[PDB]
Amino acid sequence: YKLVCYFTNWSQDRQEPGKFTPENIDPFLCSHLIYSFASIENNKVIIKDKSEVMLYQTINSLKTKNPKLKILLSIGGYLFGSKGFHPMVDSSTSRLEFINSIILFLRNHNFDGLDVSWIYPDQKENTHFTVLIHELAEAFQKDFTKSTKERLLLTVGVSAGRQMIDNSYQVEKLAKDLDFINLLSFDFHGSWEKPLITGHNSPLSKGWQDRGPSSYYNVEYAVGYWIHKGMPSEKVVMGIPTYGHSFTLASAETTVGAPASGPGAAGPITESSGFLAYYEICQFLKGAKITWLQDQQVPYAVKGNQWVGYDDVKSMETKVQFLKNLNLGGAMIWSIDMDDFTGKSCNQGPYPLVQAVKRSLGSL
Numbered sequence: 001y002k003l004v005c006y007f008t009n010w011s012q013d014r015q016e017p018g019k020f021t022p023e024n025i026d027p028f029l030c031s032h033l034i035y036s037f038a039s040i041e042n043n044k045v046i047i048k049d050k051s052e053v054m055l056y057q058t059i060n061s062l063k064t065k066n067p068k069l070k071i072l073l074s075i076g077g078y079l080f081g082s083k084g085f086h087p088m089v090d091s092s093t094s095r096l097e098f099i100n101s102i103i104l105f106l107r108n109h110n111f112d113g114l115d116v117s118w119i120y121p122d123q124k125e126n127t128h129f130t131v132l133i134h135e136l137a138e139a140f141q142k143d144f145t146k147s148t149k150e151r152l153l154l155t156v157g158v159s160a161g162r163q164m165i166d167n168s169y170q171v172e173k174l175a176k177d178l179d180f181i182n183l184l185s186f187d188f189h190g191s192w193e194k195p196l197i198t199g200h201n202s203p204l205s206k207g208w209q210d211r212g213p214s215s216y217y218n219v220e221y222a223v224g225y226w227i228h229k230g231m232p233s234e235k236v237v238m239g240i241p242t243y244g245h246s247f248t249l250a251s252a253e254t255t256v257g258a259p260a261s262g263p264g265a266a267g268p269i270t271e272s273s274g275f276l277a278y279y280e281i282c283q284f285l286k287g288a289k290i291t292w293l294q295d296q297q298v299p300y301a302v303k304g305n306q307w308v309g310y311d312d313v314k315s316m317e318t319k320v321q322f323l324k325n326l327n328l329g330g331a332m333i334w335s336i337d338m339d340d341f342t343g344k345s346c347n348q349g350p351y352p353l354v355q356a357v358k359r360s361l362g363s364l
């Protein structure tokens with residue numbers, strides 16, 4: 001099994017216990033690490049990060065410590081959107097420039113591959129995304145035929161939502177071109193929804209109130225659908241979140257599907273109404289009531305008018321058992337810098353969530 005771990009370049013600006021740098025990375029924690037995110041300037045790959053050159057130092061230390069560790073570079077993410085890939089994708093000339101810059105950049109800086117996480121192609125960018133991936137795949141393969149080093153890996157963070165999947169992807173082709181997908185099996189529910197009701201960020205299974213299309217909004221369905229569409233199960237690396245989605249409750253009802261007036265109060269460290277990192281969640285749970293959903297196989301917690309749907313150690317072990325049953329490629333984490341990486345907040349040691357995933361994957 002793979003354990004694929006995204007980390008981010010904005011977590012370094014947080015205060016403790018959320019102040020993360022690549023030096024917080026345990027080189028034996030994960031099989032793959034993925035830096036989030038690179039940029040594109042003048043159709044070439046760059047890293048925009050005040051700490052860029054220190055990142056390279058840590059990459060080299062980590063890979064020296066653990067010769068098996070793979071470290072990939074990611075382009076994309078929600079904020080980058082589709083706009084970020086233009087004008088690079090607009091022509092084969094500009095795409096060739098990009099692809100050539102990637103190979104040189106990854107080799108120069110000791111990266112093992114590229115993750116393309118286009119959020120999201122949809123109908124409009126379906127062709128652009130398909131060709132980009134295919135051209136990258138071929139170039140990497142070409143490079144390999146000429147090289148003494150391993151072939152550069154190619155992966156993609158992909159939607160777990162059935163409609164977005166149908167619109168964005170040509171799955172059989174993707175299966176040939178990608179080494180694996182990083183299934184983004186989270187953000188199923190949240191304070192952007194209308195009607196504005198509580199719902200879990202990342203339920204494993206369908207809710208008792210779900211019927212029809214709402215029956216798609218869970219991890220088991222997403223996984224099954226990708227397989228159905230032609231992605232081999234062992235190329236499905238299943239995303240698990242270390243964050244939760246929060247709601248401010250509109251009434252006294254505290255159940256799933258209860259009315260919400262908006263996102264929950266911002267965490268003190270992440271300062272973004274609507275989500276909480278796990279290290280903030282452990283502080284939230286103090287004085288909260290926690291319910292484990294038997295239908296959906298994940299917890300939520302309520303304190304005052306605040307409702308948080310999140311993933312804990314029980315969820316980690318339950319989702320790992322699931323991915324193993326379905327013969328998936330492994331687990332992916334978004335993101336390790338939102339786990340309690342210092343261990344100072346949750347009283348469960350360093351990376352309590354990710355370590356549980358690791359322990360569960362390694363268990364016979």
Ligand SMILES: CC(=O)N[C@@H]1[C@@H](O)[C@H](O[C@@H]2O[C@H](CO)[C@@H](O[C@@H]3O[C@H](CO)[C@@H](O[C@@H]4O[C@H](CO)[C@@H](O)[C@H](O)[C@H]4NC(C)=O)[C@H](O)[C@H]3NC(C)=O)[C@H](O)[C@H]2NC(C)=O)[C@@H](CO)O[C@@H]1O
Nearest residue numbers: 010076077078079080117119157159184187243272275334
């Ligand atoms: C609105 C919404 O929730 N949409 C989701 C979308 O976020 C999902 O995108 C994937 O999953 C994760 C988890 O949501 C994404 O993480 C977010 O990524 C953005 C950057 O793209 C983060 O923005 C950062 O925000 C902090 C906090 O305000 C700022 O300080 C930073 O400057 C800013 N970073 C940058 C580069 O500008 C945001 O905080 C992340 N949120 C969380 C909770 O971590 C991630 O982008 C994306 N994952 C991958 C691998 O591409 C998407 C999944 O399908 O669904 C919805 O569209």
